[PDB]
Amino acid sequence: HMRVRIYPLALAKVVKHAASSLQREVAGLLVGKSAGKVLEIWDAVTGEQYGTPAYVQLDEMVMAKVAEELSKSDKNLYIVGWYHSHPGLDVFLSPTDIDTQKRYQAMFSKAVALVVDPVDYAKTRRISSLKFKVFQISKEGRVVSLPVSIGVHRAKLLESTFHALSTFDFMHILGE
Amino acid sequence: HMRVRIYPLALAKVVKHAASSLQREVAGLLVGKSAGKVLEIWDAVTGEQYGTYVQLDEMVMAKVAEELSKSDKNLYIVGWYHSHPGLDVFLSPTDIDTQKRYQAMFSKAVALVVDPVDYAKTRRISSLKFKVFQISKEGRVVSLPVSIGVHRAKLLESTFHALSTFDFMHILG
Ligand SMILES: [Zn+2]
Ligand SMILES: [Zn+2]
């Protein structure tokens, strides 16, 4: 099965997003690149930041805007999938999620769906309580859970952290 | 010489703060913990976030310390950072006096000095220009060996924490 490597700030952003809002399902886009046979996840962007607080995984206009912006980044990054939370429901793809993931794979064969259920992590504050999986649909149409590692290659760790920090939609007050 | 292990989000926050002010020196606090003989830097926080020359501000440092204390990640103030845009990376006479005062309070305290100009221009990691210093028993300024922290569990813990402390209401402009 394809290995997935997630750099730590991408995962932190997913988790913070999911755990921040336990009474609803949140979603966003995964940003990264292939590294030989491994799919690397460098960043995660919320639907909210692009104006879509629910179901941004289905929002083609947002995907095109994110893709156009990455067109400039010059780290050679692209959309690699989508994420969403399932608070209190555990981690799986629903029938609708499967259809969404099939469409993602049509546009990029290595696309993945990260599903997180942050409830236990919110309760214990231990990262070990996190429940998440990264899925693809197999060629036989089966949902498969992929092996996930944390990315630690030092140069890419630095680059990915600097990138993911730069895209975090921090709260701010503008000067006039 | 003491090894310094800096987790990547802490570095990134220092550099982002420094690169946001290319026409003036900025400063902040380093947060971390000792891991045997190694000093770990887990986070870097600005004075602004606590109301702040923050490296000299004992009221802020006490507030930062109190708050770190109540959370149980066993993190502490372990030094200070500041930028020298366009001037390269050294400790000035004034910085040396500041650093001596830090080491009086915590023997492993360090001074990170960053010159963000090349990084601001290229956005390449290879353009980073920074050093981490202590003052020796003889009064010499020692540049310490620096590694990037990659231990998987601490890398996650430090990243999740440093993101949490970044996410405040920034007053810009
Ligand atoms: Zn779902
Ligand atoms: Zn200085």
Residue numbers in the entry:
A (entry chain A): 0 to 175
B (entry chain B): 0 to 51, 54 to 174
Publication text:
The first complete archaeal Ub modifier system, including E2 and E3 enzymes, was discovered in 2011 in Candidatus Caldiarchaeum subterraneum. C. subterraneum Ub (CsUb), E1, E2, and E3 are organized in a single operon, adjacent to a second E3 protein and a JAMM protease (CsRpn11) with high sequence similarity to eukaryotic Rpn119. We have shown that CsRpn11 is highly active on its own, cleaving both CsUb precursors and, at a later stage of the ubiquitination cascade, CsUb-conjugated substrate proteins. Our bioinformatic, structural, and biochemical results reveal unique features of the archaeal proteins, but also remarkable conceptual similarities with their eukaryotic counterparts.
To determine crystal structures for CsRpn11, we used the full-length wild-type form and a series of truncated proteins with deletions C-terminal of the JAMM core domain. Using these constructs, we obtained crystals for full-length CsRpn11 and truncated CsRpn11Δ149–202, for which we collected data to 1.65 Å and 1.35 Å resolution. The CsRpn11 structure could be solved by molecular replacement using the Rpn11 coordinates from a Saccharomyces cerevisiae Rpn8–Rpn11 heterodimer. We located two protomers in the asymmetric unit, which form a homodimer grossly reminiscent of the Rpn8–Rpn11 heterodimer. However, while the latter is assembled in an antiparallel fashion, the CsRpn11 homodimer is parallel, with an interface formed by the first and the fourth alpha-helix, H1 and H4, of CsRpn11. Notably, based on static light-scattering (SEC-MALS) measurements, CsRpn11 appears to be monomeric in solution. In structure superimpositions, CsRpn11 displays the highest similarity to S. cerevisiae Rpn11 (DALI Z-Score 21.2), but also superimposes well with CSN5 (Z = 19.2) or BRCC36 (Z = 19.7). In CsRpn11, however, Ins-1 displays a certain degree of conformational flexibility: In one protomer of the full-length structure it is fully ordered, but partially disordered in the other. In both, the conformation is different from the eukaryotic one, but both obstruct the catalytic groove in a similar fashion, suggesting a conserved function of this insertion. With the crystal structures shown here, we cover three stages of the reaction cycle: In the CsRpn11 structure, the deubiquitinase is armed for cleavage, while the CsRpn11Δ149–202–CsUb complex represents the state immediately after the cleavage reaction.
